[PDB]
Enzyme design. Structure first.
Site, PDB file in Angstrom:
ATOM      1  N   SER A 107     109.768  11.784  97.654  1.00  0.00           N
ATOM      2  CA  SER A 107     110.113  13.144  98.124  1.00  0.00           C
ATOM      3  C   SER A 107     111.064  13.020  99.324  1.00  0.00           C
ATOM      4  CB  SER A 107     108.849  13.917  98.394  1.00  0.00           C
ATOM      5  OG  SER A 107     109.123  15.304  98.446  1.00  0.00           O
TER       6      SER A 107
ATOM      7  N   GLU B 222     109.123  20.172  87.865  1.00  0.00           N
ATOM      8  CA  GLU B 222     109.497  20.022  89.290  1.00  0.00           C
ATOM      9  C   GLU B 222     110.685  20.906  89.615  1.00  0.00           C
ATOM     10  OE1 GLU B 222     109.162  16.800  91.871  1.00  0.00           O
ATOM     11  OE2 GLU B 222     108.870  15.309  90.251  1.00  0.00           O
TER      12      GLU B 222
ATOM     13  N   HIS C   6     105.216  16.987  91.005  1.00  0.00           N
ATOM     14  CA  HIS C   6     105.801  16.309  92.177  1.00  0.00           C
ATOM     15  C   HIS C   6     104.931  15.142  92.630  1.00  0.00           C
ATOM     16  CE1 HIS C   6     108.494  16.042  95.501  1.00  0.00           C
ATOM     17  NE2 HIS C   6     107.542  16.304  96.371  1.00  0.00           N
TER      18      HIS C   6
HETATM   19  O1  LIG Z   1     108.589  15.537 100.936  1.00  0.00           O
HETATM   20  N1  LIG Z   1     108.161  16.422 100.291  1.00  0.00           N
HETATM   21  O2  LIG Z   1     107.179  16.249  99.653  1.00  0.00           O
HETATM   22  C1  LIG Z   1     108.879  17.689 100.177  1.00  0.00           C
HETATM   23  C2  LIG Z   1     110.028  17.693  99.519  1.00  0.00           C
HETATM   24  C3  LIG Z   1     110.809  18.983  99.343  1.00  0.00           C
HETATM   25  C4  LIG Z   1     110.344  20.087  99.871  1.00  0.00           C
HETATM   26  O3  LIG Z   1     111.085  21.231  99.684  1.00  0.00           O
HETATM   27  C5  LIG Z   1     109.020  20.117 100.631  1.00  0.00           C
HETATM   28  C6  LIG Z   1     108.337  18.988 100.785  1.00  0.00           C
END
Ligand SMILES: O=[N+]([O-])c1ccc(O)cc1
Length: 295
Positions: free
Chosen positions: A143, A237, A267
């Site tokens: 992420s 996702e 995710h």
């Molecule tokens: O790092 N993450 O898991 C995230 C990635 C994107 C987001 O819009 C919010 C949290």
């Protein structure tokens, strides 16, 4: 997809880790979730000062002591910790038969961009200083940490630092504006990431900087010369098109990129590998990919 996906989706639709009303409640919520996954007795965790960045070595019985993944946790550049991601770190260490350095890079809003990238590059340079060999190294992250993986490689390359053998991005976040088509078209099937929490966290990380700043949003970075890159992403996702656009940009820059879209996965589904068969299958693939590039 496995029936277990329904269980994970139901958990996420109730916990809504990215929708907590304060940053401290978001941080505490993710820590509480991570506490659920039972950590095996055979995992050895060693606190270390990684050249001025706090970290933890994660080792399992079959860790090759000379192979190292620098692991960059997700959480929107705002949440996550050594505690939240030590389970995913040990699963990767097991599958890749390597050690993992899991770093506590500086988080926003307290420490905005570029603090995270200063810390990831410092930790990598410290691994080299202390005798790690780039051909035995990789950088990986989920992420925000997947975006930070790409930004770290770009910054290291631009500083003339030898790049590692490979890198791995799990559902990377590389578009801080949330303008991918899937941010609209997958909104109804994503139980974790939506545009509003994305923009909330982007604001804390950017602190008024251009949202297309290349080391913050590596969709806009120069990717020429990066090492082989595995991108794993789920088709359920809103961030699907972050991975598709990253793959397009990296391939246009001559990078050896593998884009693996996992049908119906959510995710960072790999984090749920204790209960979700596709999570453990995807981690086994990360291990195969890393071992192939260390051969
Ligand atoms: O790092 N993450 O898991 C995230 C990635 C994107 C987001 O819009 C919010 C949290």
């Amino acid at each position: 997809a496995s029936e277990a996906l329904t269980m994970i989706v139901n958990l996420l639709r109730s916990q809504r880790p990215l929708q907590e009303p304060t940053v401290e409640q978001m941080r505490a919520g993710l820590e509480a979730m991570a506490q659920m996954s039972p950590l095996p007795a055979d995992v050895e965790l060693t606190t270390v000062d990684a050249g001025g960045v706090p970290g933890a070595w994660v080792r399992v019985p079959e860790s090759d002591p000379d192979r190292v993944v620098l692991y960059l946790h997700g959480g929107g550049y705002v949440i996550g910790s050594i505690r939240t991601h030590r389970d995913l770190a040990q699963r990767i260490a097991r599958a890749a038969r390597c050690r993992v350095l899991l770093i506590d890079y500086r988080l926003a809003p307290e420490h905005p961009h570029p603090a995270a990238v200063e810390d990831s590059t410092r930790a990598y340079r410290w691994l080299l200083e202390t005798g790690s060999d780039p051909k035995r190294m990789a950088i990986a992250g989920d992420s925000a940490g997947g975006g930070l993986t790409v930004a770290t490689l770009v910054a290291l390359r631009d500083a003339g630092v030898p790049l590692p053998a490979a890198a791995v991005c799990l559902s990377p976040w590389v578009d801080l504006e949330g303008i991918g088509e899937s941010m609209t078209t997958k909104a109804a099937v994503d139980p974790m990431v939506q545009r509003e929490p994305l923009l909330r966290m982007a604001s804390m990380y950017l602190a008024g900087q251009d949202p297309r700043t290349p080391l913050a949003a590596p969709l806009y970075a120069d990717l020429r010369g990066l090492p082989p890159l595995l991108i794993q992403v789920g088709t359920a996702e809103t961030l699907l098109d972050d991975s598709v656009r990253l793959a397009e940009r990296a391939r246009a820059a001559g990078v050896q990129v593998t884009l693996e879209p996992w049908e119906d996965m959510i995710h960072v589904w790999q984090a749920f590998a204790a209960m979700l068969p596709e999570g453990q299958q995807a981690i086994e693939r990360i291990g195969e990919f890393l071992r192939q590039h260390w051969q």
